[PDB]
Amino acid sequence: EKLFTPLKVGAVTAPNRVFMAPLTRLRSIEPGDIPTPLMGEYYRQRASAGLIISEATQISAQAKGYAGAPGLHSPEQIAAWKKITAGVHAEDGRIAVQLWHTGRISHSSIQPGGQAPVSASALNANTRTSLRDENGNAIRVDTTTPRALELDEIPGIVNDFRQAVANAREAGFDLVELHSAHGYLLHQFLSPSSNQRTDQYGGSVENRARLVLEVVDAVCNEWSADRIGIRVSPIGTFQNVDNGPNEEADALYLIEELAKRGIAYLHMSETDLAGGKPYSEAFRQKVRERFHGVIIGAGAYTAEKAEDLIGKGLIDAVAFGRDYIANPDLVARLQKKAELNPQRPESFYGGGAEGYTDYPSL
Ligand SMILES: Cc1cc2nc3c(=O)[nH]c(=O)nc-3n(C[C@H](O)[C@H](O)[C@H](O)COP(=O)(O)O)c2cc1C
Ligand SMILES: O=[N+]([O-])C1=CCCCC1
């Protein structure tokens, strides 16, 4: 077994390879998109993870696409996150913040000024996001057709990522994870299906990857490359965003470019919840030869699959999502070969302590 052995992840040393995947839970305070002490407790309970990767967190108000998702742009958000990271550190944990801009997976009612959300192109996501009703409960709503960003708006987006990383470093996070997956803004630019631009940010794969690589360079310069991770979902379809007709080649291009920056990690979300074709071993080998940081695999993993791929020298760590919702001490359970708590999906999104901080340890 290698799952319970340490791993250097950029500037941080994880004591094991069992990571907590980023999990949107939609329990922040509105107004202000403010993290809470309840969220702090939840993270503290999971501090034995080799690395906790937070719920996706807004870089800006414009970045918001879900009612109840937290931000990391305001003073009050910074102050609330500082308490949360301090609590994780008091338990000897490590925590990365996942930073997103939701782009077109959003709704005008939760945008600044009530305006249409932004994207690479003016194309509806054709999916749903989560708002809150008059009683504060999560509800699904169809996404609003976005406005295509103007060329002169792009530097501001890059700056918003940079600024949120300054704020994250201040707030006590150990690492940042850029959310370049699952059909959010960065992935909207990467995918030819969502990006129909004919300027320097669309068309060729170099142009489609331009924004994400400008963001990577800005955030490495703000902090350090060894503090930056990135999540990608570059093979298959995620929330109605496919990866185009040359998905493997285009993925390898991006990964070779990322490798040049010497970033801490590449986190590959391999499948959505409905599943699909596994990554080929050949593809995993191509990724591994091109990237010289930590590789984290995710998506309906088992401990056995993680051990197998780590043993094969293809990945370094695994991120578990749903099993971490339900098992605060997932590390101990996997180490001991104990049963896993029963999941309660009705309380994944929104609400309070129930289905959030009430899953027991062994
Ligand atoms: C409730 C819920 C919230 C999620 N939130 C995020 C998120 O904030 N960021 C992200 O990149 N993926 C998110 N995902 C995907 C998970 O990180 C993970 O990739 C997915 O659940 C598949 O892994 P699993 O089989 O271990 O659960 C979410 C998944 C679920 C079930
Ligand atoms: O950011 N994400 O990937 C998700 C957020 C909430 C819905 C599930 C996917």
Summarize the structure.
The chain contains 11 helices and 14 strands.
What share of residues are in beta strands? Answer: 15-25%
Task: Tell me the CATH superfamily.
Answer: Aldolase class I
* Top CATH class: Alpha Beta
Any idea what the shape is?
globular
Distance between the termini: 21 Å
Strand order of the largest sheet: 3-14-13-12-11-10-5-4
Unique ligands? flavin mononucleotide, 1-nitrocyclohexene
Family: Belongs to the NADH:flavin oxidoreductase/NADH oxidase family.
GO molecular function, one term: FMN binding
Pfam family, one: Oxidored_FMN
Cofactor: FMN
What descriptive keywords fit this protein?
362 residues, alpha/beta, TIM Barrel, eight-stranded parallel β-sheet, two-stranded antiparallel sheet, 11 helices, binds flavin mononucleotide, binds 1-nitrocyclohexene
